[PDB]
């Protein structure tokens with residue numbers, strides 16, 4: 001059944017709750033972003049109102065074939081009334097179209113639902129600065145102190161420098177980047193930009209990217225693989241067997257592959273820095289795992305929460321085990337005692 005952490009009290013609303021059939025008493029279904037664990041269950045047969053960003057609405061229409069009459073896109077940073085309740089959508093700094101949602105309950109309670117987010121100090125100057133938030137539904141993906149990772153900017157500088165050096169040393173090297181969802185587009189766009197190439201990809205992935213309102217996108221991507229020296233493949237294909245296979249497909253146009261796997265966290269984060277990362281190499285193929293995250297580090301999460309000073313925190317990630325739930329509750333209490341709320 002629908003878990004309590006997907007329901008907004010005092011309303012008929014649910015958030016990211018499309019796989020339970022009809023939720024008894026739901027009058028509006030919000031969707032924070034287009035990732036499959038969140039939209040799971042939506043299709044052309046859905047007949048309840050879906051509230052979301054413009055970009056998530058484009059993906060629902062074009063990829064899932066949800067009918068236009070059930071898609072309700074809302075502008076960001078704008079007070080809107082939904083079924084009698086004031087809401088605001090905020091940029092979540094996750095993937096394209098991803099939002100946080102502020103609910104203003106008729107009784108005066110204010111609720112923030114972060115969806116999935118990567119906390120940033122810029123959020124401290126949004127419409128959140130303007131009133132008190134009582135209850136926080138929090139993306140706790142990386143809620144433990146071991147989870148450090150570099151800034152997105154640091155990671156993209158590493159990727160750009162690595163690729164430019166490799167291709168300038170060997171003009172017959174191909175760059176491949178893995179993907180299995182929307183998000184982390186800066187990785188392949190930044191590398192293609194420094195190399196004066198468009199990124200080449202499958203017709204399905206091109207269609208997905210043409211839904212994201214990225215400025216000048218027609219100048220940056222293509223379905224013509226041959227004309228491109230940055231290819232995107234399914235993340236599954238980013239291994240030596242998959243890459244040797246791919247290289248055969250290019251008809252001796254290339255003699256070397258340099259591949260990127262943008263992971264979340266991996267345990268080499270605890271020891272090694274970004275300047276010191278090394279690839280796995282077999283033959284003329286080298287694979288770099290780069291820690292490009294679209295979720296909060298522990299410290300970023302902690303700063304946001306200590307700034308916001310909520311009365312109550314409801315985790316939305318890692319909630320399935322008693323050990324995880326207890327660990328999280330211990331950090332929340334530490335944070336509240338340190339900051340004095």
Ligand code: NI
Nearest residue numbers: 033035094116
């Ligand atoms: Ni997500």
